[PDB]
Amino acid sequence: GSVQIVYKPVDLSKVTSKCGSLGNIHHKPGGGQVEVKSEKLDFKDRVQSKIGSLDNITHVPGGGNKKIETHKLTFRE
Amino acid sequence: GSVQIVYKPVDLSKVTSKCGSLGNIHHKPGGGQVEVKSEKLDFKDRVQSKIGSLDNITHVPGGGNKKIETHKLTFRE
Amino acid sequence: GSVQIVYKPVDLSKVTSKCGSLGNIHHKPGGGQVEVKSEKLDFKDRVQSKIGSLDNITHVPGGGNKKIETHKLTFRE
Amino acid sequence: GSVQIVYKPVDLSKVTSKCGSLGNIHHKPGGGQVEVKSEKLDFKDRVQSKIGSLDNITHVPGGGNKKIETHKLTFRE
Amino acid sequence: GSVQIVYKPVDLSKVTSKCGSLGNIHHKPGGGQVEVKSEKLDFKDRVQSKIGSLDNITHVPGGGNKKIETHKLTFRE
Amino acid sequence: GSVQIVYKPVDLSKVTSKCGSLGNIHHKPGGGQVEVKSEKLDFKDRVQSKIGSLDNITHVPGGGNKKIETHKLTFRE
Structure with a gap:
């Protein structure tokens, strides 16, 4: 029994x-x-x-863009 | 019994x-x-x-765009 | 018994x-x-x-667009 | 007698x-x-x-788009 | 008699x-x-x-896009 | 009699x-x-x-895009 997995996104x-x-x-x-x-x-x-925090924040990014990726190939036996 | 998996999105x-x-x-x-x-x-x-927090926030991103992706190939036996 | 799976969205x-x-x-x-x-x-x-929070928020993104994708191929036996 | 042509497409x-x-x-x-x-x-x-030609052609462009233009100002006398 | 051509496409x-x-x-x-x-x-x-040619051609460009232009100002006398 | 050509595409x-x-x-x-x-x-x-040619061609460019231009100011007399 041969198993072949190709992972090419x-x-x-x-x-x-x-x-x-x-x-x-x-x-x-x-x-x-x-x-x-x-x-x-x-x-x-x-x-x-x-506890007891008081935050003033003035965040002004000129872009502020974000990308997130996760890849996960898992194998058993 | 041969198993072949191709993963190409x-x-x-x-x-x-x-x-x-x-x-x-x-x-x-x-x-x-x-x-x-x-x-x-x-x-x-x-x-x-x-507890007890008081936050002032002025977030003004010029883009503020976001992308999220997850890929997951799992295999057993 | 051969199994072939192709995953190409x-x-x-x-x-x-x-x-x-x-x-x-x-x-x-x-x-x-x-x-x-x-x-x-x-x-x-x-x-x-x-507990006890008081938040002032002024979020003004110039885009503010979002995309979410999840891909999941799972296999057993 | 003056002449004035302004060719600005x-x-x-x-x-x-x-x-x-x-x-x-x-x-x-x-x-x-x-x-x-x-x-x-x-x-x-x-x-x-x-003479006597035998051509086999496969052409599979991913775009294959075309644009053609021919500007032509001509002047005499 | 003056002449003035302004070719500015x-x-x-x-x-x-x-x-x-x-x-x-x-x-x-x-x-x-x-x-x-x-x-x-x-x-x-x-x-x-x-004469007597036998051509086999496979052409598979990933784009294959084209643009052509031919500007031509001509002047006489 | 003056002449003035301004070729500025x-x-x-x-x-x-x-x-x-x-x-x-x-x-x-x-x-x-x-x-x-x-x-x-x-x-x-x-x-x-x-004469007598036999050509086998595979052409697989990753782009294959083209641009051509031919500017031509001509003047006489």
Whole structure:
């Protein structure tokens, strides 16, 4: 019993943008207040956590395009 | 018993945009207030959590396009 | 008993947009208030949670287009 | 007596195609026979000729599109 | 008497194609036979000729697109 | 009497192709036979000729695109 597998996908795909100008952008939020009160913090087994955060973000990429691919050939016996 | 598998998908797909100008954008929210009160925090087994957060975000990508692909050939016995 | 599988899908698909200008956009919400009170927090077995959040978001992508594909050939015995 | 010619043709044309796949094509003609008998051949000036030819042609272009133009301003006296 | 010619043709044309795959092509003609018999051949000036030819041609271009132009301003006296 | 010629053609043309794959191509003609019999051949001036030829050609360009132009300003007297 002979097994033959050929795995030859092809992609010529493009992910693209064009823009004339980004222009004037004004991030001006009023001052927030964040208060958190807790007594104990027990953490185990791959847990991840964020407490009391206050983030201001002004992300203005001229492109900002993204492509994701995954290929996976798996074999048993 | 011979098994032959051929895996040859083709894509020439495009994900694209054109824009004249982004123009004036004004992120100006009033100051929020966030209060959280808790006594104990027990965390285990891949849990992830966010408490008391106050996020202001002004994301203005000139493209912002996205493509996702997954290929998966699996075989047994 | 011979098994032959051929997997050759083709796509030339496009996902595209055109825009003259994005123009003036004004995110100006009044200041919210969020209060949460809790005594205990027990978390296990892949749980994920968000408490007391107050998010202001002004997402203005010049394209914002998205494509998703999945291919899956599976075989047994 | 003045003369003024402004030859300014503007071209924005496109000649285009899409095809998914060209597929299986089978050029299998039976064997031809060509016999020509002649005694004398006298040629002069701009003659061009072909005798006793047997051509098999397969032509499978992925596009095969064509454009031709012939601009011609002529002036006298 | 003045003369003024402004030969300014503007070209923005495109000749283009997409193809997914060219696929299996099978040029398999049967064996031809070509016999030509002649006694004398006298040629002069601009003659060109072909005799007794047997051509097998496979031509499979991935594009195969063409553009031709012939601009020609001519002036006299 | 003044004369003024402004020969300024502007070209922004494109000739282009995409192809996913060229695929399996099988040039397999049967064996031809070519017989030519002649007594005398006298040629003069600009003659060009071919006799008794048997050509097998496979041509598989990945693009195969062409562009030709022939600008020609001519002036007299």
